[PDB]
Each structure stands twice: as C-alpha cells, then as structure tokens.
Design a protein around this motif. Structure first.
Motif, PDB file in Angstrom:
ATOM      1  N   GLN A 198       0.767  -1.236   0.000  1.00 32.49           N
ATOM      2  CA  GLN A 198       0.000   0.000   0.000  1.00 32.49           C
ATOM      3  C   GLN A 198       0.808   1.302   0.000  1.00 32.49           C
ATOM      4  O   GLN A 198       1.760   1.470   0.759  1.00 32.49           O
ATOM      5  N   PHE A 199       0.409   2.207  -0.888  1.00 29.92           N
ATOM      6  CA  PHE A 199       1.013   3.529  -1.044  1.00 29.92           C
ATOM      7  C   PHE A 199       2.368   3.569  -1.726  1.00 29.92           C
ATOM      8  O   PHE A 199       2.969   4.627  -1.865  1.00 29.92           O
ATOM      9  N   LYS A 200       2.828   2.424  -2.196  1.00 28.60           N
ATOM     10  CA  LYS A 200       4.085   2.372  -2.916  1.00 28.60           C
ATOM     11  C   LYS A 200       3.797   2.415  -4.414  1.00 28.60           C
ATOM     12  O   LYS A 200       2.787   1.874  -4.853  1.00 28.60           O
ATOM     13  N   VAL A 201       4.610   3.143  -5.184  1.00 28.62           N
ATOM     14  CA  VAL A 201       4.396   3.194  -6.618  1.00 28.62           C
ATOM     15  C   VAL A 201       5.363   2.255  -7.323  1.00 28.62           C
ATOM     16  O   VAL A 201       6.534   2.168  -6.966  1.00 28.62           O
ATOM     17  N   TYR A 202       4.828   1.499  -8.280  1.00 23.52           N
ATOM     18  CA  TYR A 202       5.586   0.514  -9.038  1.00 23.52           C
ATOM     19  C   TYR A 202       5.530   0.738 -10.541  1.00 23.52           C
ATOM     20  O   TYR A 202       4.726   1.530 -11.045  1.00 23.52           O
ATOM     21  N   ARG A 258      -3.570 -10.896  -7.277  1.00 20.61           N
ATOM     22  CA  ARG A 258      -3.785  -9.576  -7.872  1.00 20.61           C
ATOM     23  C   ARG A 258      -3.626  -8.487  -6.820  1.00 20.61           C
ATOM     24  O   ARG A 258      -3.522  -8.772  -5.622  1.00 20.61           O
ATOM     25  N   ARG A 259      -3.725  -7.239  -7.256  1.00 13.53           N
ATOM     26  CA  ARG A 259      -3.534  -6.096  -6.371  1.00 13.53           C
ATOM     27  C   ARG A 259      -4.291  -4.864  -6.897  1.00 13.53           C
ATOM     28  O   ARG A 259      -4.257  -4.592  -8.095  1.00 13.53           O
ATOM     29  N   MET A 260      -5.020  -4.151  -6.038  1.00 11.68           N
ATOM     30  CA  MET A 260      -5.751  -2.952  -6.473  1.00 11.68           C
ATOM     31  C   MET A 260      -4.748  -1.839  -6.708  1.00 11.68           C
ATOM     32  O   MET A 260      -3.984  -1.475  -5.823  1.00 11.68           O
ATOM     33  N   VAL A 261      -4.881  -1.189  -7.849  1.00 13.43           N
ATOM     34  CA  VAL A 261      -3.923  -0.183  -8.283  1.00 13.43           C
ATOM     35  C   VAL A 261      -4.551   1.044  -8.977  1.00 13.43           C
ATOM     36  O   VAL A 261      -5.618   0.948  -9.577  1.00 13.43           O
ATOM     37  N   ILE A 262      -3.907   2.203  -8.863  1.00 18.52           N
ATOM     38  CA  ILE A 262      -4.380   3.420  -9.531  1.00 18.52           C
ATOM     39  C   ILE A 262      -3.254   3.914 -10.446  1.00 18.52           C
ATOM     40  O   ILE A 262      -2.162   4.245  -9.993  1.00 18.52           O
ATOM     41  N   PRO A 263      -3.489   3.932 -11.755  1.00 22.12           N
ATOM     42  CA  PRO A 263      -2.425   4.398 -12.649  1.00 22.12           C
ATOM     43  C   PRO A 263      -2.140   5.886 -12.528  1.00 22.12           C
ATOM     44  O   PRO A 263      -2.994   6.664 -12.114  1.00 22.12           O
ATOM     45  N   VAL A 307       3.191  -8.812 -12.659  1.00 19.00           N
ATOM     46  CA  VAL A 307       3.454  -7.708 -13.577  1.00 19.00           C
ATOM     47  C   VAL A 307       3.924  -6.471 -12.825  1.00 19.00           C
ATOM     48  O   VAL A 307       4.363  -5.491 -13.426  1.00 19.00           O
ATOM     49  N   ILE A 308       3.827  -6.508 -11.500  1.00 21.08           N
ATOM     50  CA  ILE A 308       4.257  -5.387 -10.670  1.00 21.08           C
ATOM     51  C   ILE A 308       5.790  -5.408 -10.609  1.00 21.08           C
ATOM     52  O   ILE A 308       6.392  -6.328 -10.073  1.00 21.08           O
ATOM     53  N   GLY A 309       6.412  -4.394 -11.195  1.00 19.05           N
ATOM     54  CA  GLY A 309       7.864  -4.312 -11.229  1.00 19.05           C
ATOM     55  C   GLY A 309       8.560  -3.716 -10.023  1.00 19.05           C
ATOM     56  O   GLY A 309       8.208  -3.991  -8.881  1.00 19.05           O
ATOM     57  N   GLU A 310       9.559  -2.888 -10.301  1.00 14.87           N
ATOM     58  CA  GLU A 310      10.361  -2.241  -9.273  1.00 14.87           C
ATOM     59  C   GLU A 310       9.623  -1.173  -8.485  1.00 14.87           C
ATOM     60  O   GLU A 310       8.811  -0.453  -9.039  1.00 14.87           O
ATOM     61  N   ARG A 315       5.495   3.117 -17.238  1.00 16.22           N
ATOM     62  CA  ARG A 315       4.076   3.051 -16.874  1.00 16.22           C
ATOM     63  C   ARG A 315       3.995   2.872 -15.356  1.00 16.22           C
ATOM     64  O   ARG A 315       4.242   1.787 -14.859  1.00 16.22           O
ATOM     65  N   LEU A 316       3.662   3.940 -14.626  1.00 15.92           N
ATOM     66  CA  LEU A 316       3.618   3.895 -13.172  1.00 15.92           C
ATOM     67  C   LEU A 316       2.223   3.709 -12.594  1.00 15.92           C
ATOM     68  O   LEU A 316       1.239   4.116 -13.202  1.00 15.92           O
ATOM     69  N   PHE A 317       2.141   3.099 -11.417  1.00 14.86           N
ATOM     70  CA  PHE A 317       0.860   2.946 -10.742  1.00 14.86           C
ATOM     71  C   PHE A 317       1.041   2.852  -9.231  1.00 14.86           C
ATOM     72  O   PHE A 317       2.093   2.434  -8.765  1.00 14.86           O
ATOM     73  N   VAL A 318       0.044   3.315  -8.479  1.00 17.05           N
ATOM     74  CA  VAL A 318       0.086   3.281  -7.018  1.00 17.05           C
ATOM     75  C   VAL A 318      -0.778   2.147  -6.466  1.00 17.05           C
ATOM     76  O   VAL A 318      -1.966   2.069  -6.757  1.00 17.05           O
ATOM     77  N   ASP A 319      -0.173   1.295  -5.648  1.00 16.43           N
ATOM     78  CA  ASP A 319      -0.867   0.183  -5.003  1.00 16.43           C
ATOM     79  C   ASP A 319      -1.681   0.809  -3.865  1.00 16.43           C
ATOM     80  O   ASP A 319      -1.115   1.405  -2.952  1.00 16.43           O
ATOM     81  N   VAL A 320      -3.006   0.673  -3.926  1.00 21.06           N
ATOM     82  CA  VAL A 320      -3.882   1.258  -2.907  1.00 21.06           C
ATOM     83  C   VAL A 320      -4.649   0.244  -2.086  1.00 21.06           C
ATOM     84  O   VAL A 320      -5.505   0.612  -1.285  1.00 21.06           O
ATOM     85  N   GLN A 321      -4.346  -1.032  -2.287  1.00 20.55           N
ATOM     86  CA  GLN A 321      -5.022  -2.084  -1.544  1.00 20.55           C
ATOM     87  C   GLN A 321      -4.374  -2.279  -0.175  1.00 20.55           C
ATOM     88  O   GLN A 321      -3.175  -2.110  -0.021  1.00 20.55           O
ATOM     89  N   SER A 322      -5.178  -2.639   0.816  1.00 16.92           N
ATOM     90  CA  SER A 322      -4.695  -2.878   2.166  1.00 16.92           C
ATOM     91  C   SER A 322      -3.625  -3.964   2.202  1.00 16.92           C
ATOM     92  O   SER A 322      -3.652  -4.897   1.409  1.00 16.92           O
ATOM     93  N   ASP A 323      -2.684  -3.829   3.132  1.00 16.51           N
ATOM     94  CA  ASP A 323      -1.621  -4.811   3.293  1.00 16.51           C
ATOM     95  C   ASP A 323      -2.103  -6.020   4.097  1.00 16.51           C
ATOM     96  O   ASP A 323      -1.448  -7.058   4.135  1.00 16.51           O
ATOM     97  N   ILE A 324      -3.275  -5.886   4.701  1.00 17.57           N
ATOM     98  CA  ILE A 324      -3.850  -6.955   5.497  1.00 17.57           C
ATOM     99  C   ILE A 324      -4.694  -7.906   4.622  1.00 17.57           C
ATOM    100  O   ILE A 324      -5.014  -9.018   5.028  1.00 17.57           O
TER     101      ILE A 324
END
Ligand code: CL
Ligand code: CL
Lengths: 101, 95
Positions: free
Chosen positions: B2-6, B24-29, B69-72, B9-18
């Motif tokens: 959560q809150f880390k950008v990967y 899969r993972r919820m993401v906002i481009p 597909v989530i990179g660095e 083509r960048l995107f922010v992981d907004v899904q809970s860590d719990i």
C-alpha cells in the motif's frame, strides 16, 4: 448507477457486475464495477465480509471484490437488479479491501 | 504494498496490506500532470511528486493488476495517505 447490477454487452469476461461508483461522480466514459460469480464456484470458507453473497433471481452470487474494474459505459448492458438494500455489506467489503477496517 | 508506486508506466498500489488476494492487487495508474489542465479536480485526481516530475493519480481508472506484472518499487507515497484515501472515498461514497 450505484448498486444496480448489469450485464456485460460483450461475450467474454463477465456475466454480471455491480456498479459501485458514486452517482455524484461522472467519469464520464467509465464506471467502477465489481464482477459477480456463481456462489457454487467458491466454498463457504471464503470470507463473506470481503466477498458478500447476493441473491438475483433464484440464484446466489459472490461479489468478486478483489477483481474490481473500470468498465466503459458503452459495454454496460441491461439493468438486472437493484442491490441498494445490501448497501451496508457492499460498503464494508470495499472499505475492508482498501482500509483493512 | 500500500502507497508504494511501481512500474511494469507507473501505478500506485492502494489495496490494504492486510488483504492478500493473493494473485492480484488494487492499483491506480499515474499519468503525467502536463496531460491534464489544472481545472481537473485535485480532490478526485490528486497531484503527486516522484523524482523531479508531477503526476496525476487517475483514480477513475483503478484496476486489479496481477502481482507478476508489478515491477520495481519507485517511490513511497505514504505521506499522501490522506489525499489518496479522500480521492477513493469520493469516487465511491461521494463524501
Ligand atoms: Cl441479496
Ligand atoms: Cl507528493
């Protein structure tokens, strides 16, 4: 519209889906949606808090919360049901996925 | 996470860590802030800074992306938690 379930006008990825985006927010070309899957496909050990069970017609469906997606409005088909009465359970599932309530 | 950008083509992981999907993972481009005028809501589309560039969170284009597909990891936007939380809550509950 929010809490209404629709049919996918395309023949490939979804049967039914629930529009969960606010009615006050016009994207406008897309819409936040949660696909539904037949409840038989998942055992009852799967969290009903994260994946609530809804009833449409004489069948049970699981809301696949973790597979939420933005779908373009031109693909949103016929309105099939209105799950407004399940607002609380739907709100909780989404809030759990993001904020781990 | 959560809150880390990967990247990919960048995107922010907004899904809970719990919450582990787990595949899969919820993401906002993110899109370059220059592409959008400043008349576009910063409440629904917050502006974030990564490196020496400004980016717009394309909230309404949120998507479930498979973890393979989530990179660095490129940045950690934890400090923008409040703005990110408000944008998501606005999109769903029209706060
Ligand atoms: Cl129901
Ligand atoms: Cl920032």
């Amino acid at each position: 519209m929010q809490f209404k379930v629709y049919t996918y006008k395309r023949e490939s990825r979804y049967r039914l889906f629930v529009d969960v985006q606010s009615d006050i927010i016009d994207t406008p070309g897309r819409r936040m949606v949660i696909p539904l899957a037949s409840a038989r496909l998942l055992s009852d050990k799967v969290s009903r808090e994260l994946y609530p069970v809804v009833h449409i017609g004489d069948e049970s469906w699981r809301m696949m919360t973790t597979d939420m997606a933005s779908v373009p409005v031109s693909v949103i088909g016929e309105e099939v049901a209105d799950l407004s009465h399940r607002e609380n359970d739907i709100k909780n599932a989404i809030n759990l996925m993001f904020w781990g309530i």
